[PDB]
Amino acid sequence: TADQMVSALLDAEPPILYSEYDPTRPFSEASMMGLLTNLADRELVHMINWAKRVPGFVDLTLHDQVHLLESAWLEILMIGLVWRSMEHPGKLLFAPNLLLDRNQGKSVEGMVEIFDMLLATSSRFRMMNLQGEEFVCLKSIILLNSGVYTFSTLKSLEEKDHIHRVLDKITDTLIHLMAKAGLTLQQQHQRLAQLLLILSHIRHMSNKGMEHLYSMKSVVPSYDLLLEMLDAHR
Amino acid sequence: TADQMVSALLDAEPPILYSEYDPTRPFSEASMMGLLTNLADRELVHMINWAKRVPGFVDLTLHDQVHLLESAWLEILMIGLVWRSMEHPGKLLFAPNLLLDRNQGKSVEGMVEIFDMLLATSSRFRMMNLQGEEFVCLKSIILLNSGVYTFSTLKSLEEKDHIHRVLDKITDTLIHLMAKAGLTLQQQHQRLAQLLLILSHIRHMSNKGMEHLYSMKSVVPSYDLLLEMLDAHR
Ligand SMILES: CCCN(C)C(=O)CCCCCCCCCC[C@@H]1Cc2cc(O)ccc2[C@H]2CC[C@]3(C)[C@@H](O)CC[C@H]3[C@H]12
Ligand SMILES: CCCN(C)C(=O)CCCCCCCCCC[C@@H]1Cc2cc(O)ccc2[C@H]2CC[C@]3(C)[C@@H](O)CC[C@H]3[C@H]12
């Protein structure tokens, strides 16, 4: 049911991790990229656990699970960051001990442009009063949607049909949440659209972020890493 | 009204332009990039005329009109291409005299990857049976939405509020179209979501296309070009 979908997603939420650095040492000696890389690397392991709990995800082939996570990982990191930063105007809560403003983004060439986008997205979330139940629906939508247009064998046709069925169930769930909040039918469809259009901007920001990461010529999980992490034993 | 919005958008549609090349000359001697650049350059002029007819667009400042078109131009070109290609499986109808398959995209390094995405998007449009009235709504949404998160003066706050009001009116229009087609309330909100999620993929494809164009180090309209074209006399 829609209420069961909501509880499942909320129950699956990953933990909020801390940055790893000597708090009794001067900040200017740290590698900003080192801290951010190390944080994301640890978040990615919990990402895989969360993804396996998104209803419908483990019904797909391992190959298609990997394709979806390879497309979506940075969008999923970024929507979590924007959500964890919503109540910190002007700052990005990478971790509770790593709350950064835009001037701190200037320590890495090209990064302040990305921080500005993330900050503006968190502002948009605040303006709309995004609720946590909506947040978990949108994050699941990113996981299922971001790689689905870039997979026509029979099995692929079946995998795409299943993804679109799950996506439709999440839509039904978002509408149900909004009807419960007292929105009119018109406000429900307007708010659904506003939320989904924000996903376009998250995609944009992920593309700009990935371009920035690739420009360091080093900071990106490989196909084989994600495959090994998703291909678990019992 | 919603019906008036639909008629206004349909009436504003740009013409379908032809590629410029000697049809009595061998194809292998043409510059593929030359043909594609020259086509897009001519489409951009008609783009500006169309944008000025999207309800609400000319109410914005010239500066914000330019920002929106600078963000959105390639997405708007690409959604038109995908729409003009819907009934040509396996081909991209850049122009009626320039219908290209994926092997023709291999003549420019890096381009076949983009052609594959565009082709897969046109397939998705065919699968959903996208209607022309829906197409014009989605194209207007791209224009209004793609640059709205990347503009907090009072005037900017007013410009963003107006954009979001127009966007909400287009949502209402898309729902109205779907109710008229006989869809249930559930199918209406599911189809609205499916359409808006495709816009995320169009954004993605524009980002990959822009990366490809910038990699030629040359093929992109400048801020000053768009400003001069939008800043018309009477
Ligand atoms: C084959 C084995 C592979 N082997 C050897 C490995 O070590 C495998 C590890 C491979 C994964 C390594 C990925 C590291 C990604 C770091 C992302 C970084 C942290 C972060 C964290 C967040 O929560 C939310 C968002 C963001 C990003 C936002 C956009 C930013 C600011 C960009 O502009 C520059 C930095 C970016 C931020
Ligand atoms: C300051 C004055 C400036 N000055 C001097 C000028 O000349 C101002 C002209 C500046 C504008 C020039 C932009 C040229 C853009 C060409 C885009 C090209 C044609 C096209 C047409 C479509 O309808 C739909 C889509 C697409 C694109 C899809 C993605 C593709 C395949 C990429 O992978 C490589 C080619 C791309 C396709």
Side-chain angles (χ1 to χ4, degrees), chain A residues 1-24 26-28 30-164 166-216 218-234, chain B residues 1-24 26-28 30-164 166-216 218-234:
Chain A
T1 56
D3 284 344
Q4 273 162 9
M5 185 45 111
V6 173
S7 294
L9 294 180
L10 290 167
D11 275 4
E13 274 294 280
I16 291 173
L17 302 188
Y18 277 67
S19 183
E20 274 199 274
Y21 62 89
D22 201 344
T24 70
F27 188 62
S28 88
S31 172
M32 178 68 74
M33 279 318 296
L35 294 176
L36 293 176
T37 299
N38 179 261
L39 171 68
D41 284 350
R42 289 178 285 117
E43 294 186 85
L44 283 162
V45 184
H46 294 276
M47 202 179 293
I48 282 152
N49 285 339
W50 160 82
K52 286 172 175 244
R53 294 179 65 172
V54 168
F57 186 80
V58 298
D59 300 321
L60 298 171
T61 63
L62 161 67
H63 180 267
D64 284 350
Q65 293 178 35
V66 176
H67 173 82
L68 293 180
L69 278 165
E70 190 175 26
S71 290
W73 67 272
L74 183 58
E75 291 173 79
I76 294 166
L77 288 181
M78 287 165 159
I79 195 183
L81 174 67
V82 169
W83 167 253
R84 289 180 332 249
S85 304
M86 215 187 98
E87 298 311 331
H88 305 276
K91 302 200 188 256
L92 294 174
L93 196 145
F94 281 93
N97 65 338
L98 195 69
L99 182 68
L100 304 180
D101 61 35
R102 86 178 293 268
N103 290 334
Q104 289 168 305
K106 300 178 175 168
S107 69
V108 177
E109 187 70 17
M111 193 161 76
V112 75
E113 289 77 20
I114 311 300
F115 271 35
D116 291 334
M117 300 195 278
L118 291 161
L119 286 161
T121 304
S122 184
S123 290
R124 176 68 179 148
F125 274 21
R126 202 188 306 124
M127 138 155 78
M128 302 196 55
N129 194 14
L130 182 74
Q131 302 297 295
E133 292 68 25
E134 296 173 318
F135 162 69
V136 296
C137 287
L138 290 178
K139 193 173 49 167
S140 287
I141 284 169
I142 289 168
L143 174 67
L144 291 173
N145 181 66
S146 294
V148 72
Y149 314 100
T150 51
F151 274 179
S152 296
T153 58
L154 191 57
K155 204 157 100 193
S156 277
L157 286 178
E158 273 155 13
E159 299 265 288
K160 281 184 265 155
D161 181 79
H162 169 73
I163 291 164
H164 282 300
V166 183
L167 281 167
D168 285 341
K169 182 65 182 295
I170 301 172
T171 303
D172 284 1
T173 296
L174 277 167
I175 293 287
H176 175 80
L177 285 161
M178 285 173 202
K180 274 175 73 173
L183 274 63
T184 76
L185 267 182
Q186 183 179 34
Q187 312 170 300
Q188 290 165 44
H189 70 52
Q190 290 180 357
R191 189 175 175 81
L192 174 66
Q194 283 153 7
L195 291 182
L196 299 180
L197 287 181
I198 294 164
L199 295 193
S200 270
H201 189 59
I202 293 170
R203 179 81 73 111
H204 180 74
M205 272 208 298
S206 170
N207 283 329
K208 295 310 208 243
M210 288 297 303
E211 178 170 23
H212 186 222
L213 292 172
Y214 281 125
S215 86
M216 300 163 176
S218 170
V219 293
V220 170
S222 62
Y223 186 77
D224 293 335
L225 186 44
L226 292 171
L227 184 42
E228 187 281 329
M229 317 174 60
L230 278 164
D231 183 17
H233 57 77
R234 305 169 182 200
Chain B
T1 56
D3 284 344
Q4 273 162 9
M5 185 45 111
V6 173
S7 294
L9 294 180
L10 290 167
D11 275 4
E13 274 294 280
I16 291 173
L17 302 188
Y18 277 67
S19 183
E20 274 199 274
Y21 62 89
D22 201 344
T24 70
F27 188 62
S28 88
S31 172
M32 178 68 74
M33 279 318 296
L35 294 176
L36 293 176
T37 299
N38 179 261
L39 171 68
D41 284 350
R42 289 178 285 117
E43 294 186 85
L44 283 162
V45 184
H46 294 276
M47 202 179 293
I48 282 152
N49 285 339
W50 160 82
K52 286 172 175 244
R53 294 179 65 172
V54 168
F57 186 80
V58 298
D59 300 321
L60 298 171
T61 63
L62 161 67
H63 180 267
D64 284 350
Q65 293 178 35
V66 176
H67 173 82
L68 293 180
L69 278 165
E70 190 175 26
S71 290
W73 67 272
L74 183 58
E75 291 173 79
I76 294 166
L77 288 181
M78 287 165 159
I79 195 183
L81 174 67
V82 169
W83 167 253
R84 289 180 332 249
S85 304
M86 215 187 98
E87 298 311 331
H88 305 276
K91 302 200 188 256
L92 294 174
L93 196 145
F94 281 93
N97 65 338
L98 195 69
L99 182 68
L100 304 180
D101 61 35
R102 86 178 293 268
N103 290 334
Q104 289 168 305
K106 300 178 175 168
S107 69
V108 177
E109 187 70 17
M111 193 161 76
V112 75
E113 289 77 20
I114 311 300
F115 271 35
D116 291 334
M117 300 195 278
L118 291 161
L119 286 161
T121 304
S122 184
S123 290
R124 176 68 179 148
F125 274 21
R126 202 188 306 124
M127 138 155 78
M128 302 195 55
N129 194 14
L130 182 74
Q131 302 297 295
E133 292 68 25
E134 296 173 318
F135 162 69
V136 296
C137 287
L138 290 178
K139 193 173 49 167
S140 287
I141 284 169
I142 289 168
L143 174 67
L144 291 173
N145 181 66
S146 294
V148 72
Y149 314 100
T150 51
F151 274 179
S152 296
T153 58
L154 191 57
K155 204 157 100 193
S156 277
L157 286 178
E158 273 155 13
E159 299 265 288
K160 281 184 265 155
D161 181 79
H162 169 73
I163 291 164
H164 282 300
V166 183
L167 281 167
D168 285 341
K169 182 65 182 295
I170 301 172
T171 303
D172 284 1
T173 296
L174 277 167
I175 293 287
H176 175 80
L177 285 161
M178 285 173 202
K180 274 175 73 173
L183 274 63
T184 76
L185 267 182
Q186 183 179 34
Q187 312 170 300
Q188 290 165 44
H189 70 52
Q190 290 180 357
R191 189 175 175 81
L192 174 66
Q194 283 153 7
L195 291 182
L196 299 180
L197 287 181
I198 294 164
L199 295 193
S200 270
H201 189 59
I202 293 170
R203 179 81 73 111
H204 180 74
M205 272 208 298
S206 170
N207 283 329
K208 295 310 208 243
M210 288 297 303
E211 178 170 23
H212 186 223
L213 292 172
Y214 281 125
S215 86
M216 300 163 176
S218 170
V219 293
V220 170
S222 62
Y223 186 77
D224 293 335
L225 186 44
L226 292 171
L227 184 42
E228 187 281 329
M229 317 174 60
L230 278 164
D231 183 17
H233 57 77
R234 305 169 182 200

